[PDB]
Design an enzyme around this catalytic site. Structure first.
Site, PDB file in Angstrom:
ATOM      1  CB  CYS A 106      -2.911  -1.975  -2.085  1.00 48.69           C
ATOM      2  SG  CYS A 106      -1.339  -2.830  -2.256  1.00 48.69           S
ATOM      3  CE1 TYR A 116       4.874  -6.069  -4.888  1.00 45.70           C
ATOM      4  CE2 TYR A 116       3.654  -8.159  -5.966  1.00 45.70           C
ATOM      5  CZ  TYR A 116       5.061  -7.311  -5.356  1.00 45.70           C
ATOM      6  OH  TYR A 116       6.222  -8.119  -5.139  1.00 45.70           O
ATOM      7  CG  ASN A 151      -3.663  -4.937  -6.309  1.00 47.02           C
ATOM      8  OD1 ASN A 151      -4.080  -5.566  -5.498  1.00 47.02           O
ATOM      9  ND2 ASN A 151      -2.544  -4.090  -6.049  1.00 47.02           N
ATOM     10  NE  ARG A 190      -8.312  -6.953  -2.829  1.00 42.53           N
ATOM     11  CZ  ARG A 190      -7.519  -6.060  -3.602  1.00 42.53           C
ATOM     12  NH1 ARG A 190      -7.431  -4.872  -3.827  1.00 42.53           N
ATOM     13  NH2 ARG A 190      -6.466  -6.931  -4.386  1.00 42.53           N
TER      14      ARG A 190
END
Lengths: 317, 317, 317, 317
Positions: free
Chosen positions: C1, C80, C173, C216
């Protein structure tokens, strides 16, 4: 700077490092002998060396070392650690006090192994003090090696002196050692053989090519991990140089904030079992070698082995 | 393989190349003398060499060359070009016919300059024929250099033999030369100095680190473009080696489809003005040198200069 | 995410997140009302909610939330954090005990601001306990936001709950938060405008394109740092979606160790000041909205606002 | 801009494209009817359309289209191609003359399929002529699609109109098409599933993240190659948007040489079989649709379907 350890098939160990810098250090390999009295710049107190060693050094008051291998197989290298190195401002007590640029001399002269370092370092205090030639406190951290084949990295942090088992046997510069080891998780996909054709090398895509410390760390670990085993001391020395060739900065490739040329000045390899120190430098490719044990280790004063300075070319006709 | 030209401040030129391969070539530097009669494997017809030269060679019937520098300053290097090299299947006529592995011998023995090559190559035909030792047609392309300081790349394509001004003065392997030169546009942001601090090198982020031909090409061009100028022939030779250190493959780093170790076997530098050929190889860092002009260039047969094979270590004690 | 906060020009704040997973969660937006009684899976002990909130959840015994926004402007998202999350194995005392998947419910039901968080959390214990549906203890960490525009990230470690000021306003994460913030230093050379022509975007070269957490994180920091200011709430919500489009995983792009497809299932944006919850999901691009304040916040039971499931197409003819 | 075709499981085909620019184009979807008379800016000569189509255009004298889909299933999109586009300076004869910005109108009005394209184009001349609005000759190249599922890319070069079978079904901008297809060979190691744990996506490491044309080309080929099959039209349209989300430029992320913000203004997806034109734009995520066939294709004049301009929000309460 890029450093790494390697182990050969006959079970010798070497510790290898490049020395990348803008200012010319003018180091030479020097024997620091046993029972040699020197005074710390931390507080003026006297020390007496117990173990002899050789490494790249420079007389600046005392002779400061960038690395070295001692008579009992302990080897050490000091590499830049800017922004992360933090020393003691206030002089403690019941501790030995040294300045950062003395750590190599200290640990090589007083310790005989990694166990030994881990123990003596508990009563040591490194304090914040400049190196006059540079008018600055050296930000440093250290990689060490002995004949058991274990490796340590030691990092002077705000929290105190931190000690790590260095499992990859690699170290460059900032940031801190766990940061780099964690960063290796991003790179476990690079591999020597393609998956299933401009040429060779496709599995190798993603290997970082730039001269930042994190990329040099990853590129050293990759090349160390897939090195074909080296049969003996000499083949080990060659391999360490072959790997470090890949982190050699030509003049011009990298320029500092001050418009200075940051390049690889020398590369050395030190063999824990044999007390041999090999090296070449920017201007002379040929390996040069000093054998610690050919010397009188009870010598009364340091001995300098000065290097061949130009390109030593073997003429075939 | 990675090749590049450099120019020094006193205006000499060198052409430098690594030789990366899995099979052991066992080349040695050899003088091919003037007026030397040999027969082509294309059609058995006789040729007679006009210009003498030296380069890395191997006796395999005739002595085949991977590169070389001749008596009039023309220098050439053959590098692998797999999947892109395309030869003539059908023997033309009113042309000289050679096989791919003869091109080095041809062009160095018969041409005296780049103008000369551009002209003689118009009546040449390279035909598809195997090299028995390998039982395969060598896919190759060539980079050439002379005393004017210009550089050419020549590529045998389906459309015929293509000639390019090689402006960057770099060449690796596949794909075709314009492809790589276009690919350089993606990399004009890499630079020696950071924009405005784990250490040095941040401007250098994005430099490709892997061993594929496109990345080696980009990494050579970067390092050539920001090389501090080299003052003279020797300093030029050092620099070419320093740059090519960055494209040196240690054994194990790269594995072929056949499970073979693809590594850098030798690296050479050839000086157009002086007829000097320098080299080292995987196992011996020290530069070795052959001077073309110390030889009798009217010699009756080839002369081999065989290399020091082990690590030549200079002992300081 | 991937998650990030933004500030608009009229000084509203939003917290935004994609939910990337392999298992279909089936969250819907649910209102958890004030004064609502529930019991913790940790020990069965009673809780009474103080602040109403909405967020994506699912009824799995109690109603488990992946995120939400409360009536007094505090927002939180659970993401997560595998390999790094570490909970308390043993029940302490004089503390409120919850399991990992109850954090969002707890923090949002009981805290009115980030200050209030930093204080109540001092007496919270999160205990290792499985989510039954998945037969595993969720490894989680949390990003939070309020009407002050400060942000926090909270990470459950071996050593306890760590709380960080999150300056960039981004979290993905693993690994740990300081790891990522440190890693951003490698990427400060990425920039919107080229230095000095295939097209636009050359300054952007180096931005990581892969779907791993560190990549990310860096791509979200780049885009957010350089976003043009968004005039108001709606514009803020658009911008958040435009950024997170760049970290949106199509089905097939990423596959887990178990051969499941791991893809972006929904994307939400919460405005702190207005209690507005916006989202879209993989199968329906149109933004959907739930207004916390249009409901009776004293409602006896939770209320589900089920999503338009199919692509909602606006037909112009 | 980034463009790509997809095939659904029920064997429909879509052609999709983002429109990235700095100048606000202000295209709306417009129906160009059959039997519609227009005159070319090339020479003033008469044209009568044969096939009706819809696509994003603007009235600028005649009505200029960036893309469109015609009644007999041919689709086309025009994308920037700076530095490489080359038109005819002199008017030929026995040929139809058009200017660059009329290509889409021409090809879609006159051709019924790709075969029909490859044949009519043999007697087309595109001439260098400015678009007045912008005071420059548009450098353009084109991707096309039909109901056979084949794709073509057509590029105006120094040497004439080049036509390529486009196997990947992807095109961005410069350099030339074969350049990109060749470059894909560096990226064949990227893959959805890791080899053998911060999270998911490690196989994906190496996917280019920047907004330059070569990088977006590779990222589109990766995502399309590994997309799970889309069941039908709607699902196809969703998938195309999910992919192109990954090449969506937020405002501020990319800045031109003139200091203008270059960002993704709209994104469209055209289905070949059904004459359906779907899109969304920077300020409104909801998909909007124009059904070519709901109109009178014999209509006397063009018809504009103006877009919902603001974020169309679906309110659940």
């Amino acid at each position: 700077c890029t450093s790494l350890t390697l182990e050969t098939a006959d079970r010798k160990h070497v510790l290898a490092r490049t020395m990348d810098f803008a200012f010319q250090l003018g180091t030479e390999v020097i024997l620091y002998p046993r029972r040699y009295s020197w005074n710390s710049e931390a507080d003026g107190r006297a020390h007496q060396t117990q173990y002899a060693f050789i490494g790249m050094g420079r007389k600046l008051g005392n002779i400061l070392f960038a690395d070295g291998i001692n008579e009992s197989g302990l080897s050490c290298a000091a590499l830049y650690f800017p922004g992360y190195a933090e020393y003691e401002k206030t002089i403690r007590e019941d501790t030995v006090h040294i300045v950062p640029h003395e750590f190599v001399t200290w640990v090589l002269s007083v310790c005989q192994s990694l166990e030994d370092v881990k123990e003596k370092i508990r009563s040591l205090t490194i304090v914040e003090k400049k190196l006059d030639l540079l008018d600055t406190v050296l930000p440093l951290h250290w990689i060490l090696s002995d004949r058991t084949g274990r490796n340590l990295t030691i990092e002077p942090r705000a929290d105190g002196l931190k000690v790590y088992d260095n499992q990859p046997g690699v170290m460059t510069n900032s940031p801190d050692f766990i940061w780099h080891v964690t960063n290796l998780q991003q790179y476990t996909g690079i591999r020597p053989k393609q998956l299933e054709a401009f040429g060779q090398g496709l599995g190798t895509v993603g290997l970082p090519g730039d001269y930042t410390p994190p990329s040099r760390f990853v590129r050293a670990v990759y090349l160390k991990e897939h090195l074909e085993p080296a049969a003996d001391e000499t083949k080990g020395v060659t391999a360490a140089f072959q790997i470090l060739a890949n982190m050699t900065i030509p003049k011009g490739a990298v320029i500092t904030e001050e418009d200075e040329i940051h390049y690889t000045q020398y590369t050395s390899v030190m063999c824990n079992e044999t007390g041999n120190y090999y090296f070449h430098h920017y201007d002379n490719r040929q390996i040069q070698k000093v054998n610690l044990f050919h010397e009188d280790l009870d010598c009364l004063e340091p001995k300098v082995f000065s290097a061949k300075a130009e390109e030593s070319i073997h003429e075939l006709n």
